[PDB]
Design a protein around this ligand. Sequence first.
Ligand SMILES: [Mn+2]
Ligand SMILES: [Mn+2]
Ligand SMILES: [Mn+2]
Ligand SMILES: [Mn+2]
Ligand SMILES: [Mn+2]
Ligand SMILES: [Mn+2]
Ligand SMILES: [Mn+2]
Ligand SMILES: [Mn+2]
Ligand SMILES: [Mn+2]
Ligand SMILES: [Mn+2]
Lengths: 368, 368, 368, 368, 368
Amino acid sequence: ATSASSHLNKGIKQMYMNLPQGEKIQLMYIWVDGTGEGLRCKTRTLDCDPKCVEELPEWNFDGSSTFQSEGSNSDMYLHPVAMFRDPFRRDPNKLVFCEVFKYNRKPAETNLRHSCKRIMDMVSSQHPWFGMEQEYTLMGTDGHPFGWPSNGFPGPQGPYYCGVGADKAYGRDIVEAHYRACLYAGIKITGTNAEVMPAQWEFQIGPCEGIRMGDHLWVARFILHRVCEDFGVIATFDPKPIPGNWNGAGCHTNFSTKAMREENGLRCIEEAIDKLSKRHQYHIRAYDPKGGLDNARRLTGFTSNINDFSAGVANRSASIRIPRIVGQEKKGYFEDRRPSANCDPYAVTEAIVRTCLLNETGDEPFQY
Amino acid sequence: ATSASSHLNKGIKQMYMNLPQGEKIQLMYIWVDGTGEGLRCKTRTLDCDPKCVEELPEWNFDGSSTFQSEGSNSDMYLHPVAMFRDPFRRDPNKLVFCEVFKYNRKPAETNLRHSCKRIMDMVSSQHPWFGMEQEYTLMGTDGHPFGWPSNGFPGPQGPYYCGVGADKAYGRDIVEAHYRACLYAGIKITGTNAEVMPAQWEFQIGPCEGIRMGDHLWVARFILHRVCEDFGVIATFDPKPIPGNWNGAGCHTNFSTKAMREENGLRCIEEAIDKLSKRHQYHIRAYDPKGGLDNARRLTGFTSNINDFSAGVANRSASIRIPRIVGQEKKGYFEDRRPSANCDPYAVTEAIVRTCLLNETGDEPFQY
Amino acid sequence: ATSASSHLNKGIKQMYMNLPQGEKIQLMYIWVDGTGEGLRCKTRTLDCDPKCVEELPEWNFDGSSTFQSEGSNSDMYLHPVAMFRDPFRRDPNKLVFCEVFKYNRKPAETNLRHSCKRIMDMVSSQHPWFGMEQEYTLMGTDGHPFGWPSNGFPGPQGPYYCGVGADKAYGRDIVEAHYRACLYAGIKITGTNAEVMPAQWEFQIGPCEGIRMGDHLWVARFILHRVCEDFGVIATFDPKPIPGNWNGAGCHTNFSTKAMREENGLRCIEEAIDKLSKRHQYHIRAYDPKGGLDNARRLTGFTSNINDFSAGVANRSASIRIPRIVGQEKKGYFEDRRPSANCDPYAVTEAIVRTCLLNETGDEPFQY
Amino acid sequence: ATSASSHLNKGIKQMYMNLPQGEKIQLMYIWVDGTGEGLRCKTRTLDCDPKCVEELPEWNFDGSSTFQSEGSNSDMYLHPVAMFRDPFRRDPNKLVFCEVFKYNRKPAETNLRHSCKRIMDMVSSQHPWFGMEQEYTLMGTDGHPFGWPSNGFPGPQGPYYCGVGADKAYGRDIVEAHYRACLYAGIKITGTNAEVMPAQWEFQIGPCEGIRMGDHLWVARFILHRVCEDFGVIATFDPKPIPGNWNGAGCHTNFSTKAMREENGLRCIEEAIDKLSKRHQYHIRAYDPKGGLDNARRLTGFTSNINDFSAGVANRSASIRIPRIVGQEKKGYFEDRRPSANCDPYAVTEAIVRTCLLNETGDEPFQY
Amino acid sequence: ATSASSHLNKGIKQMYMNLPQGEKIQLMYIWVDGTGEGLRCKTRTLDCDPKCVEELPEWNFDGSSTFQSEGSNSDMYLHPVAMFRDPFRRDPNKLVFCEVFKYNRKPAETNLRHSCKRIMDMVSSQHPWFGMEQEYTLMGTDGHPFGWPSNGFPGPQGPYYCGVGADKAYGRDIVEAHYRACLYAGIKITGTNAEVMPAQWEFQIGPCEGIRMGDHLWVARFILHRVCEDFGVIATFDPKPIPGNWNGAGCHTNFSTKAMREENGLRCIEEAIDKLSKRHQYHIRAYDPKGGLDNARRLTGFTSNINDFSAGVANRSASIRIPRIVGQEKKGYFEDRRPSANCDPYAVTEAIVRTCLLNETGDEPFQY
Ligand SMILES: [Mn+2]
Ligand SMILES: [Mn+2]
Ligand SMILES: [Mn+2]
Ligand SMILES: [Mn+2]
Ligand SMILES: [Mn+2]
Ligand SMILES: [Mn+2]
Ligand SMILES: [Mn+2]
Ligand SMILES: [Mn+2]
Ligand SMILES: [Mn+2]
Ligand SMILES: [Mn+2]
């Protein structure tokens, strides 16, 4: 069951997009709404052919329509912070991820990018590298996963992981289109695979230094949403898209700095793991938009326990996993398997840096 | 009845694949899962534009999701061994067939390529050439062959063999696409034809010296699976896809060495045939993933008998067939008609070489 | 009602065929099965880029699957005799019409091309030119003509002959595609038209000297079959596809030699017509694969009578028709309207030459 | 695929038929058209409430519309000869099988009942008893058997004979309704079963003395036609409804007289069998409306050969079969397995009586 | 996916069955074909209104069409042995379960009722009571269980056992109709329930002394088949209708005699259980038509192991279960959980009596 807009003749759209647009450039403005998990987009025309993000002009939108402000002063300004080519409108047009701001220049409630960027500007001396493996479930318009039998379930799990075939991988066309669009847009995407759950996939955004990780992950999520809209399906980042004995959707996070990637860098990995063991409660609170409510359906064991912390080397069921190659070479990175699929990358990255590099302690972040 | 993902608009996918990806290269990693008949695929991005297979980096995957390992140490490393262009992502992207290894560098349970490669490295002085004619049945998502009437059977056998017409060949588009993809990828494919059973086809991988035969056959199987996934059907290698008076799916194997292709080389053919007559039980055990259980439904006579060995010149019903041209010219090769359609090419090729060139005897292989 | 394979997404097939195949060349081998009216095809890969037909290698196939041989020695060799470009695989790939031979080099039962070629090698001094107007009926997979109402008939005959419009010509796309494919392949096709019966068309293969007529007609029939398979319909050459007051499908034959096309050549036309009047029974026996059984449903008068011979100038209902322009100019050719639509062109052409140029008499052909 | 009239709401028809009609009585007049295998029906209202057939009035119809007469004098009179209750209009209304007569009181071309009744009036002293097992194929409106897969065939023969289950018996509702209607109408029906061919059934009309056999069989055929019309399918009496390896539809005939059912009556069975052996050609000519043309597709062996006569005890493949119980008890009847399913019962019964009781000889019947 | 005959308008069938048939009585003859698991039915008309089974006449049928005899003497006689009212044709018509016999009065290959009846005539002094709980799976015409999602599976097992609701019980209408038909026909049916597998039900035939158990169970199976045919689904008695983690279909058997139901009758239960422990191999061979081949897919543990025998009190996983109430009261019966769902009740009952009451020993039955 696909969307009604998907059944429109795409040949007409291809013919219309084949027109030479000319000097005019369409700038698609992207930002995060008040829910903290959704995205919003609207386009504008610019004729100067800009080169840098700082050249792009500020924009404003009605925040009362995005669950971001009341009716008194509902106007919210958009400050561009990321600059990417548009894969749905080819090279001349561009994708613009923006930072939401209130009417009085204050950061919005869901605008975690301001604090995240401040933290990484503080810690840039250590060069923190992040990589997050977003896992999403391809769902039809009917609320059930794509390709799943009507009013039923497919076979048991096990053949679907990284599977090839009509009965092993559902909606691979969406994944291929999203991969090509992310490569075209300049998103630092490293790879993709099919997860254990059928119609559930994964794409790994590559090492991005600091705020670039959150920027690239958010733009990749928007690109995936637009590709699924073109194909007529819905990509949901719910941690537990289907209750029962089905694999949950999570977003593991890899963390590494200059010392952790240097020779004999395992000691810093142990220090970071101990700090995360100390701040497990804060991290699990900050690893999803609902403060652990959504992640309680994925990290239920039977995925590490939500209420119990555990770490180890090459442990799939541990909250923090050290790659076996990292332990063998005594250097590399460590993977945080706690964050959910709908987690805000800015909050996750900020919490990881605060616990590791800033030695933060307590139950609340410290304002600097 | 095709897959639900097939009904997605392919024009959108074509438009997205028309984007210039640029310097980034997608490497699709392919390996054999724990079932020994299925295949798994997942992709990664590499920016160095590699030339040789040894340059490609090693990868790891969760073996517990592919019926290959337990939960203790479920990580399995991937060692690339074959290097091919990607027909589904054009020239810059590549297909990578990999060798599965355990966490402690030991070969996996289904990783027969290690022993096969060792054997052919031993016997490379004789230059063994192999060619296997894989026969597959095009099945819809409903478990019945493609193009077959709903809840029924088509006309009797005889018009469908190498037939041309709407009512004589089912799913020829898949066969043409697979042939073009195999030619593009560099797979040494020689030809194709429609088998006696409707919707059942065949493609013959050409003479490949040693381990290249298994590599090319496995990559061709993966390419066929991906093409059928694109078209929305399922290609099954079951030896007896439909019970009753319907032709079974098998994978005949041609074998030849330097002496067997030389002048007056028929004597070596007789020696090899006698050795296979001696080791019929071992060969029939090693000619399918289930140790003769699957092949018991195809080689039931009425196809040579599974429990009875027979060989001859230009004999269709014999286990080993000498081509009539080979007998006329007193040189050439001989065909082994016993292996099933789901047989692992590595095991078949290794058994043939062990019986012929290594003069192996007994009921178990000898470890060197 | 079209075939289930037709509903497959052809965009995927176009994308796969857009790949550059490279140096490898696919040779599609074509031959006539044991029924004498059907065709069989299977392809092979050749890397030498051949120029002439004699360079192409011989092939073999299982004759027991084509109603051509018993189980004792079921292998039948294929000897290429015609060389054509492949319209379904573009210029580098080629179509190969082959001559079927038994295991002991003897011509097959349905291999009339050997005797036909011998006869025309004998009579090449007179330069016999032949042209046959094959008429076929476009039928869906349901056994009823294409575009005909479900469980019914269209309007009465008369508007459909050479008609233009949605309600006047059924399946014109197949005819256009077949015409383009025949022109691309080098088939000497002269024209096409819609016959009186709806969904029944006709294409006229042009003057081809001797065995070339049979070769080109058979290759054109195969190309039509493949085009209909691509479009999902079935092209039947039955003489009476639909019983009742509907036009039958026939294949008229034009015959001319050097003297018949020369000045004052009408006398040779009268001599040939008298010889055919003498040998009407032999010709009507040899003008269809069933020895007049199939043609008894078309040549029933109400089309000349099957049991009565008649000839004249510009007579539609006569067995032999002299074109009015030929009579006016006292030179040209004459048309034989007796052969059926499923007639073997080799047998028809051989019988015509034997009666006209070889002055054959009796009820059986004379072996030379 | 059922008829369009079948999809009409039958609840409305039931409601309308629930009305009390009153004193008026509907008389459905039945007769055989010019084809000799079809039936025609039209009704009239009579208010006298008749008791005997001779009371019913004569009727007339346009014979030019039933392939029975030319346009000069196309009126044909109907003479009622059989009297039966109407199962489609309940007890007060009646079914009337009539005898067709020309304008000049001469019997029609297809009116074999006159000669048949004369013969049995001659031979009534011997009390000939006849029973014919009509076998019919339930076909949908699309020309393919009922319940058969679209554009295909069901499983092989063997499970369908007298089968019970959804996949073993097709259209059993029609058979049950026809059995109930025949029992209600007074037709001497003995039993029913499912034949080897799927959707092919059989009903055996019981021992009827003389002309009553033909009358009851024709009325039963009409009742079956009307029941199939109500259900929306077509009951065809073609001897070979589906070409190939499928069971044909035939109408075996049992014959017995007073001496043949008496003690030590086997000698008369041998005499009758010898007479039928003598007159096999006449019988096979007179056992179908087309003079053996239709039966040539059923009695092709592989059913006794059409051109070869054979008889025996408990022989299924013999033209004449003596039941094994009859041979054991030295009395009873013998079965004639030659007549086709579309045979006229009057002609079959008349030929059997002429050969057995009247000792007729030659190639043409003798007019008395 | 239901049968095409199910979509016929049942209002017409109801109207036709509403006719008063009168004095004529339809006798439906039922017997077991050569497969040993299927059933066959065909009807005849009798006008004497019989009271007892011995009054009914013998019948004959073509055994070559039921996989029961060769073509030499294919006639097989039917001897009625059970007498039941017909629920599909109301009170006047009757159901007749018959005993198949060869042409020479010898019992057929699948006619186990003769030996079973002889054994129970021998052992009638002890009054053996049997009750078998047949479990069947309601399957559509497509080969998948009724109500299951197309190309998929429903939720996991556990809510479906004896469930009530649209999503908990599939095809309850068939079960209710079958229960009513069995009660009407006089079948000693005790109860019904829905098994763990969805669309899989169970009906328990009550205590029937000796051969009556087999008779009633076979007639109940035929009634279930006819009811499913009316509703358009297929009732399969396969031991493992769906491979995987789904409950298998079995037919447990309760056994009790006069001593076992008397006071302090537990000792005889122990003796019988010990005898069955001794003869486990013979029983498991004789508990299905395929000699343990079918039951190997159901009794695989994970249902007691097929190769391991075990017995106990109130043990679900044991081959022989003593009911807990029986152990508490020291009297009653014991349940044999080994027989499969397609088991012949005659063979099961005969084996149980031979092991228990006749003290049979060895690997083959002893002919008396
Ligand atoms: Mn992963
Ligand atoms: Mn991972
Ligand atoms: Mn082959
Ligand atoms: Mn072969
Ligand atoms: Mn014309
Ligand atoms: Mn013409
Ligand atoms: Mn019969
Ligand atoms: Mn019979
Ligand atoms: Mn139970
Ligand atoms: Mn129970």
